[PDB]
Amino acid sequence: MSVSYETFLNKDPLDKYEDSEIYTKEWLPKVEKYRQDLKDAIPKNYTIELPKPIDDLIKDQFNAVDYLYSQKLLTPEEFAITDLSATELAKKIAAGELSSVEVFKAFAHRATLAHQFTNCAMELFIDEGLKQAEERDNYFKEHGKTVGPLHGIPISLKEQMNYKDKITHGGYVSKIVNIPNSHGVTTSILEKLGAVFYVRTSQPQTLMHLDSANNFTGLTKNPFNLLLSSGGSSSGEGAIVGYGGSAIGVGSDIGGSIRAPAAYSGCHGLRPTTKRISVKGGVSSGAGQESVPAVAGPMARSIDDLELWMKAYINEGKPWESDSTSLPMPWRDVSTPKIGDLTVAIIRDDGLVRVSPPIRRALNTVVEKLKGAGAKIIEFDPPNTKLAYETVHKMYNCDGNHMQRKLLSGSNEPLTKLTKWNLNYGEGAKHYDVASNRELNVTRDQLRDQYNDFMVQNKVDFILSPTYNNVAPHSEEVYNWSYTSLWNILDFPTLSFQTGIFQDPTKDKWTEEDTKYKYRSKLEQLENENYDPSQFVGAPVGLQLSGKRYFDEEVLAAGKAIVDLLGVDLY
Amino acid sequence: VSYETFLNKDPLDKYEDSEIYTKEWLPKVEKYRQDLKDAIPKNYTIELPKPIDDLIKDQFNAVDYLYSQKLLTPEEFAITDLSATELAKKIAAGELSSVEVFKAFAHRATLAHQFTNCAMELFIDEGLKQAEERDNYFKEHGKTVGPLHGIPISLKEQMNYKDKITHGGYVSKIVNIPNSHGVTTSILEKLGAVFYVRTSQPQTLMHLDSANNFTGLTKNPFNLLLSSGGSSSGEGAIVGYGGSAIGVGSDIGGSIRAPAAYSGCHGLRPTTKRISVKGGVSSGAGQESVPAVAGPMARSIDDLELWMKAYINEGKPWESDSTSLPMPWRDVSTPKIGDLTVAIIRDDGLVRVSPPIRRALNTVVEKLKGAGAKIIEFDPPNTKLAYETVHKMYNCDGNHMQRKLLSGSNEPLTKLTKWNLNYGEGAKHYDVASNRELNVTRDQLRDQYNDFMVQNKVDFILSPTYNNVAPHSEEVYNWSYTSLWNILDFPTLSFQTGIFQDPTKDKWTEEDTKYKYRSKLEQLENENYDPSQFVGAPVGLQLSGKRYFDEEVLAAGKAIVDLLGVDLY
Structure with missing residues (x-):
């Protein structure tokens, strides 16, 4: 009888x-070189000696989020930074209360811990991230203002999106030799708005699992219970956002690949109506597929942050100006x-x-x-x-x-x-x-x-x-x-x-x-x-x-009321 | 070649x-042809100067004939050469009655059909009663039912019309009788419009011309030798001749823009998913690669603007057609x-x-x-x-x-x-x-x-x-x-x-x-x-x-048409 x-x-x-x-x-x-390059990119000062071997922690249903706080793996300052919403991080940076560099180093530390426990990263480039954060602070000095509404905000990126001058394989080993010359539309909008990049997160082979198994890095695990999956196909996004390893994550969603990892891994996620956020510029098997079009969207530990991202992306990034599929329908202001x-x-x-x-x-x-x-x-x-x-x-x-x-x-x-x-x-x-x-x-x-x-x-x-x-x-x-x-x-x-x-x-x-x-x-x-x-x-x-x-605007507005009614504070 | x-x-x-x-x-086709002949209001007809075949061969300009032989009374001419924008203002002011506006257009529509063969179905009698209900509502309540109150509008045949044959040009669908209006014609009804004629289209809806086994060919009102275009064939002819204040067509391949350009009027092909196409007959069910579009045709760009603003912001197509975008029609100078x-x-x-x-x-x-x-x-x-x-x-x-x-x-x-x-x-x-x-x-x-x-x-x-x-x-x-x-x-x-x-x-x-x-x-x-x-x-x-x-296209069309001094009235 059993199936x-x-x-x-x-x-x-x-x-x-x-x-x-x-x-x-x-x-x-080529895969082994890719795996070795990821190991070489983990900063040792940000790493830790695990309480048991990782596979024992998996058998034990280890709650990595509880351990982070109970063992105080970050300093009080890093916890203070990384447990603010991206909205208030943005206001603080813009007002000169926090440097971009210091905000980056906290998240960078927390993201390395996230990877060590959940295996959520496919690519790490903390050093390039640091240089980006430095430019942000240089710009703020010279001009007295920020580059845009995401200035200095560390954002994690699903791997399958084109990243300029980096392997973009979308989980397909055959594509490990695919190196685009430019960001995809969504990533280059985020950079122009001021975001800081440093980690690209895992996804399953074929991008059609609500899970993570792939031939590059294996499985990605749930940060609240390491026996469980963190979901998919935006697998590493759910793990790293749920852990707080970044302030906002960007995924894609056909079949549930934003909402499921969010729900599985302890954070919030928005699947927007099609054709508001660009999916142009990435690797997948979906070229020309229109009957059920994929969608891209944000994940975060607060609804304000989802709202910040949509509003900035659409009203300031203006995706229709570089992606003809994207609709010029303003993100409305809703109470x-x-x-x-x-x-x-x-x-x-x-x-x-x-x-x-x-x-x-x-x-x-x-x-x-x-x-x-x-x-x-x-x-x-x-x-x-x-x-x-x-x-x-x-x-x-x-x-x-x-x-x-x-x-x-x-x-x-x-x-x-x-x-x-x-x-x-x-x-x-x-x-x-x-x-x-x-x-x-x-x-x-x-x-x-x-x-x-x-x-x-x-x-x-x-x-x-x-x-x-x-x-x-x-x-x-x-x-x-x-x-x-x-x-x-x-x-x-x-x-x-x-x-x-x-x-x-x-x-x-x-x-x-x-x-x-x-x-x-x-x-x-x-x-x-x-x-x-x-x-x-x-x-x-x-x-x-x-x-x-x-x-979508009403969805987030009511989501904000409901999370407040329920007392949900993921920070 | x-x-x-x-x-x-x-x-x-x-x-x-x-x-x-x-x-x-x-x-069944012959019965349909005979119902059209019977539906022509015999009082509104004219004696043709030569048989239609000789008019055609002579490149007859029916629009010049309309004005030089003065087939309408001064009053009818004054009504049918106002833009729908001015007509709607005057009706809502009480300076004109809807019955009065309708009869003028019903007369000029009959003449249009006599020269160009642009109609596939006529129901002036039902249109007249609709116009009475508009006038009754205006007396009872002191206001109009909506921004298109009493405005006579022609409809392409292929769109669903409640309790009427809707065949899209396919003889095999002469048996298809929908139980409700298509989405767009149902929205125009609620905005106050008045219906009386459904216009011709080609077999398969895929000609820039009109040939079909119901009524034959539709001709250009400015030169009866020439096509009026297609597949919104009768709309081009009837709007170019002035037999309706505004027309409604569909456009894959050119079927709004070509009839407008050929037959002496203006038309707008909007961006997809603003105006609904739901509820009509065509071979396009489920086809998404090049989506068909519906849109308006008129003798002034202000009227296209009026139609789009009313349809979107007051009709709200997304409430009955999940495909239509809730995207406001913006006010642009x-x-x-x-x-x-x-x-x-x-x-x-x-x-x-x-x-x-x-x-x-x-x-x-x-x-x-x-x-x-x-x-x-x-x-x-x-x-x-x-x-x-x-x-x-x-x-x-x-x-x-x-x-x-x-x-x-x-x-x-x-x-x-x-x-x-x-x-x-x-x-x-x-x-x-x-x-x-x-x-x-x-x-x-x-x-x-x-x-x-x-x-x-x-x-x-x-x-x-x-x-x-x-x-x-x-x-x-x-x-x-x-x-x-x-x-x-x-x-x-x-x-x-x-x-x-x-x-x-x-x-x-x-x-x-x-x-x-x-x-x-x-x-x-x-x-x-x-x-x-x-x-x-x-x-x-x-x-x-x-x-x-779209809003910027019309606003600049207002400007260009005025720089050229184009007045189709």
């Missing part, structure tokens, strides 16, 4: 991808609403995969807190989630895995477990014709109208829902994306936010009524039978708040 | 069957010509334009220079790639949907339908990976032209709308001057220049006779030009802006 993932692998035979002889001779040496003014529809169960006890409890606690503050809540049974799930998963692969196969077979690198999984997602290697792709588009538009009509006609402001049917999964053991992928096919702006609740092994267990549940699918059984109270201790619970399309 | 040379991409052998069509479908930088396309690199287009473009350029504007002569890059890419996008489903809709009735194929079914690789059904490569090329082209405009501080691009004035019916082949801006998706104003073809000027010069054709298609188009068979055709041109700067 093994291999029985799903019947859509792509996976026989024209791997070849261990060719990989070992032609590509493995924080009162909880009693909000109507919130609640998804307790998407109709596909039942959520585990910690998610059920945290969702229930948040709903009751909202009700108590005066919000109109609607209990919402979301329609056509099965059609939405099937349509979007067909969309992922409807080129017959042509591009993924080309990028993977170019190096013959060994296939990861969750790579085999996502290569079999829809009809796998079946290559759709144009007419059949257009029919999927029609379905998408019907779903979008069905849901938009629900919120318009019922005066619903937001939809509150789980991010995943569990807290952070064990590495290489996360299979169902339904809770995040729904908002990709609908393209609704969705905030992933920490509730302030953590799994409790003495209380987050199945009830006796739960044990007589009848599973609706093999996938639901696979996911639910992995939940074990003793093996997910203390993992944060993050939930999703979705708004109507292009109302 | 003959057009048959190009027809090697779709064998066209599973579309038409005369015996099936004759037996099962033609009876009219610029001074001296503050503009304008790039000029005199030749797109593919099809040389004919003497009247070349002369009219040059005159406008000299007017703009003379008023202080900075002029950049512009050789537009990669137009060959842009042409091939967009025409491949048109057909990359192997003509599956077009053939499904046509073969459902087995209706006979029009000449220019054969032409467009051979546009890409025709019946070659692309796989997804190939379609994604077209999307990649589209985005490289957009960035190249966006980079041009941004790096050189260019406000607008000025260019022809077509390599000739209005074409002869069924003899328009090259879409490159309009289709360039569909693949780039730049907002593009088609504006009349005030200039008209003049047979004494507008001959090929002697050096023109030494020109070496770059392609069969360029020869095919250029040899159709003859100064004596295009007399007095109006010249419209294109003003293109940066994506989502």
